[PDB]
Design a protein around this nucleic acid. Structure first.
Length: 42
RNA sequence: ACGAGAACAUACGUUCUUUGAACCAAGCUUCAACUCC
């Protein structure tokens, strides 16, 4: 009935949000033009 | 009964002296620990 998923923590065991997460969020927000933006978008 | 007989082209002597396989150059670029029920 219980299966816990915990938050990401650094080596000191004190949590933080990595910057790749926020860049993924802003990339999802910016890319509301057409889905043509590949892995060499400047 | 030879323009012949006898006679080492031999002795000595460092392929050696000086000389950076160097100079320049981000293991980096783009990525949501995630979706479904």
């Amino acid at each position: 009935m219980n299966d816990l998923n915990t938050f990401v923590k650094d080596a000191f065991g004190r949590p933080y949000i990595p910057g790749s997460s926020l860049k993924g969020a802003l990339r999802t927000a910016i890319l509301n033009d057409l889905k043509e933006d590949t892995k060499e978008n400047e």
